[PDB]
Design a protein around this ligand. Structure first.
Ligand SMILES: [Mg+2]
Ligand SMILES: [Mg+2]
Ligand SMILES: [Mg+2]
Ligand SMILES: [Mg+2]
Ligand SMILES: [Mg+2]
Ligand SMILES: [Mg+2]
Ligand SMILES: [Mg+2]
Ligand SMILES: [Mg+2]
Ligand SMILES: [Mg+2]
Ligand SMILES: [Mg+2]
Ligand SMILES: [Mg+2]
Ligand SMILES: [Mg+2]
Ligand SMILES: [Mg+2]
Ligand SMILES: [Mg+2]
Ligand SMILES: [Mg+2]
Ligand SMILES: [Mg+2]
Ligand SMILES: [Mg+2]
Ligand SMILES: [Mg+2]
Ligand SMILES: [Mg+2]
Ligand SMILES: [Mg+2]
Ligand SMILES: [Mg+2]
Ligand SMILES: [Mg+2]
Ligand SMILES: [Mg+2]
Ligand SMILES: [Mg+2]
Ligand SMILES: [Mg+2]
Ligand SMILES: [Mg+2]
Ligand SMILES: [Mg+2]
Ligand SMILES: [Mg+2]
Ligand SMILES: [Mg+2]
Ligand SMILES: [Mg+2]
Ligand SMILES: [Mg+2]
Ligand SMILES: [Mg+2]
Ligand SMILES: [Mg+2]
Lengths: 147, 187, 128, 53
RNA sequence: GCCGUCGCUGGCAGUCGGCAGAGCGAGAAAGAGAGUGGCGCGGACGCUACGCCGCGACGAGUAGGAGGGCCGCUGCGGUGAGCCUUGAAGCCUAGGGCGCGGGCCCGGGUGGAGCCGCCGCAGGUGCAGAUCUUGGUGGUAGUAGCAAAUAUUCAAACGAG
RNA sequence: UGGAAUGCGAGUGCCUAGUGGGCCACUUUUGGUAAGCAGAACUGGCGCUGCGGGAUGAACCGAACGCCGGGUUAAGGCGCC
RNA sequence: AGGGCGUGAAACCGUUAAGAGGUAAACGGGUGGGGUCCGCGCAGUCCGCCCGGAGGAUUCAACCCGGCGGCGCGGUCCGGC
């Protein structure tokens, strides 16, 4: 909608919203990121800190497939498995704990963040956190490793 | 010669909503009558919050509704949320509640109707309580958006915990000069 | 026996002359339609004495006598006979007007229907 | 000349990109062409599966 | 007195009518509230609630910003049982007007074939200038000028000359 | 017994154009013989601003501006223009 | 519409009609005068209720039959959705 833009209201106005003293010249302060060390130093200091210079090692051929390790919390651990499993785990008097396969759901590491309901679990995951292991053993349950 | 500055003579607050939807305008047409004919301030607050934008009525989560109802004193009291009541999946127990909102998500409606509660609209809330007695007006997290993490004091400045506008986080993306005490300075 | 309006107030007008454009007298390329001058050193736009007046909001007519004919009626453009059943009810306040592109054989029917409905036509003898 | 606050950006438009602009208006015609070629292969091999081995 | 802006987030769903009783300008936190013992068929307007109405104050403006345009141009989806050779667009007008204004509608002439109103959509959408681009036409102006190299005259003929 | 007078609804968060050549004036004051010169401090104007007066007039005095009618002044005037 | 011919604007020029003319022309506010046409004006708008005098209908109220519509806390009719 060009009828809703600003160029409709500026017809008749001479400088077209760009000032009468200082004209709308083409590139008054350089192109793009020009002079970030010289005359745009203050803007990059106040708004983009750390932009200049190097830090850390140069990992040459990086692999995001190797870096792939999705995490899931214990607070929403029961969202991976259906709700009737939780119903039957609360209903069973014998103590048949449900097995939550985290790698089947699509996560590798289990972190322990929130409250876990008081019933035993068997969490089959690739990696575990110490706090997650403490929460699972405090509620009741086992942490089965899998490759 | 009159020396009053006309800078702040117009109050820029809303009179009508910017939305062109007709159900919200019908609720506005009903609460304009209730706000001027009832002495209660509840109808004025609900009418005011109907005018606001999407960012000004943030979504309210189901577990945070459960917490504010487990706050004592307000037993057998309905909950009035102007925004949306969304489901929070990281909760197990849920009592029956009397929820009044514009739109409630399908998982949250299934959870409330499985717990055995009641989900009302604003016209049904006006039929039940015209002045709004027996209500608890709630609201979602206003500063909870990611946009407010960039706001405030500027980064690269001492005692300023502000997320800088970075296109992609990493090792070599705004980490070296203004952030390390080794290379230059830090704040 | 012309069609009288319901109420006939005194139609007061604050200004009757046209707001002609600055330097419309000198150049033929400059039309009489008003355009606000937006120069740095112009005489009209900063309200010098004895210059061309500017169309402010203060020149607005009263809301009771706005868009009102000197007869006392308000105009409404009518294309055919079907648009006179719209104005049969609002008769004493508003009047009708036949469009320019309407042919004479339909103008005769419009004038006859408005004479039946007692509606005043601003151009009752438009073609003949 | 950057303003108050915003992301740093590197637009890759410093080359002559307007010569090499691949417009995608061939797309529904190519969907029809793949569909006709696939139906032609399916009519060519009559008892065999249309997918393949 | 009139126009617009701002504020009172002021008032109006109460047009509750023989299914009736016509109000909440009044200095004073709150009900013209339910109970139980001692003839005549009658009553103006309203309210596109994005509308209507009442109070007060305010009104300059460069660069600049924002809002409203039932201001204007072109094309598209709908719509007007729209207009039109019993005269479309364009153009002219010492005519009637309307709107603060952008502009718009009628009357008269020319014209001969298409055009417009409303809700939306889209843009190659509005000129007074840029020693602006193209085309055309004035004052200058019947003016400068038809002045380098000695020179033409008479009679007759053709021929309207 | 909202712990002086008077007055006024306040606080807060984004996005953000234009500007980054100034000039003049009571008072103070640097350099200079001085300047309608150059450079400062407070405040107000011009810039951005029309109007009455100073004959004239970017800055002086009064006074700031929607469109009009009645009245009244400011600064200035009341021989004629 | 007369062979570069549909429509034929503006700048410019010619003719006719009208008005005017020593502070270059032109403009704003306010009037006055003269023309062009317009109000198809020139004994001046109607609309309800009542009174009085003159006229005309196959007519008023109330009953009978048929059809249609509205409502029914029929305190709580029967039957469907
Ligand atoms: Mg401007
Ligand atoms: Mg410029
Ligand atoms: Mg701008
Ligand atoms: Mg300037
Ligand atoms: Mg600039
Ligand atoms: Mg630029
Ligand atoms: Mg340098
Ligand atoms: Mg102002
Ligand atoms: Mg402001
Ligand atoms: Mg100037
Ligand atoms: Mg900028
Ligand atoms: Mg930005
Ligand atoms: Mg394949
Ligand atoms: Mg004022
Ligand atoms: Mg203003
Ligand atoms: Mg003319
Ligand atoms: Mg033809
Ligand atoms: Mg186009
Ligand atoms: Mg031009
Ligand atoms: Mg000659
Ligand atoms: Mg000569
Ligand atoms: Mg400059
Ligand atoms: Mg400087
Ligand atoms: Mg100086
Ligand atoms: Mg100022
Ligand atoms: Mg001034
Ligand atoms: Mg003097
Ligand atoms: Mg003084
Ligand atoms: Mg006066
Ligand atoms: Mg004098
Ligand atoms: Mg022709
Ligand atoms: Mg033709
Ligand atoms: Mg021709």
């Amino acid at each position: 909608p060009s009828r809703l833009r600003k160029t409709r209201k500026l017809r008749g106005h001479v400088s077209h919203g760009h000032g009468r003293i200082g004209k709308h010249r083409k590139h008054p302060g350089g192109r793009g990121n020009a002079g970030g060390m010289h005359h745009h130093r203050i803007n990059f200091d106040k708004y983009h800190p750390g932009y200049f210079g190097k830090v850390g090692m140069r990992h040459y051929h990086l692999k995001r497939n190797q870096s792939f390790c999705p995490t899931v919390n214990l607070d929403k651990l029961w969202t991976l498995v259906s709700e009737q499993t939780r119903v039957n785990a609360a209903k069973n008097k014998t103590g048949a704990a449900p097995i939550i396969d985290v790698v089947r759901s699509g996560y590798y590491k289990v972190l322990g963040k929130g409250k876990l309901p008081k019933q035993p679990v068997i969490v089959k995951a690739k990696f575990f956190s110490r706090r997650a292991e403490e929460k699972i053993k405090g509620v009741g349950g086992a942490c089965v490793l899998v490759a | 010669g009159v020396d009053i500055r006309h800078n702040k003579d117009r109050k820029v607050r809303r009179k009508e909503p910017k939305s062109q939807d007709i159900y919200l305008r019908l609720l506005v047409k009903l609460y304009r009558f209730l706000a001027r004919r009832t002495n209660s301030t509840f109808n004025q607050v609900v009418l005011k919050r109907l005018f606001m934008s999407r960012t000004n009525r943030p979504p309210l989560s189901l577990s945070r509704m459960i917490r504010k109802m487990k706050l004592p004193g307000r037993e057998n009291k309905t909950a009035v949320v102007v925004g949306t009541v969304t489901d929070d999946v990281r909760v197990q127990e849920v009592p029956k509640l009397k929820v009044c909102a514009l739109r409630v998500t399908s998982r949250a409606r299934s959870r409330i109707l499985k717990a055995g509660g009641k989900i009302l609209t604003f016209d049904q809330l006006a039929l039940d309580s015209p002045k709004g007695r027996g209500t608890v007006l709630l609201s979602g997290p206003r500063k909870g958006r990611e946009v407010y993490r960039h706001f405030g004091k500027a980064p690269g400045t001492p005692h300023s915990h502000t997320k800088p506008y970075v296109r992609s986080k990493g090792r070599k993306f705004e980490r070296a000069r203004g952030r390390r005490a080794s290379r230059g300075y830090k704040n | 026996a012309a069609l009288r309006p319901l109420v006939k107030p005194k139609i007061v007008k604050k200004r009757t002359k046209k707001f002609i454009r600055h330097q419309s007298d000198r150049y033929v390329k400059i039309k009489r339609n008003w355009r606000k001058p937006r120069g740095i050193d112009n005489r009209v736009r900063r309200r010098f004495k004895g210059q061309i007046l500017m169309p402010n909001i203060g020149y607005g007519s009263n809301k009771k006598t706005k868009h009102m004919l000197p007869s006392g009626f308000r105009k409404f453009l009518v294309h055919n006979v079907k648009e006179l059943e719209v104005l049969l009810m609002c008769n004493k306040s508003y009047c009708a007007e036949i469009a320019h592109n309407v042919s004479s054989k339909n103008r005769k029917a419009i004038v006859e229907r408005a004479a039946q409905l007692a509606i005043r036509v601003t151009n009752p003898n438009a073609r003949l | 000349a950057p303003s108050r606050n915003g992301m740093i950006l590197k637009p890759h438009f410093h080359k002559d990109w307007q010569r090499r602009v691949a417009t995608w208006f061939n797309q529904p015609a190519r969907k029809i062409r793949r569909r006709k070629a696939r139906q032609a292969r399916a009519r060519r091999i009559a008892p065999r599966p249309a997918a393949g081995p």
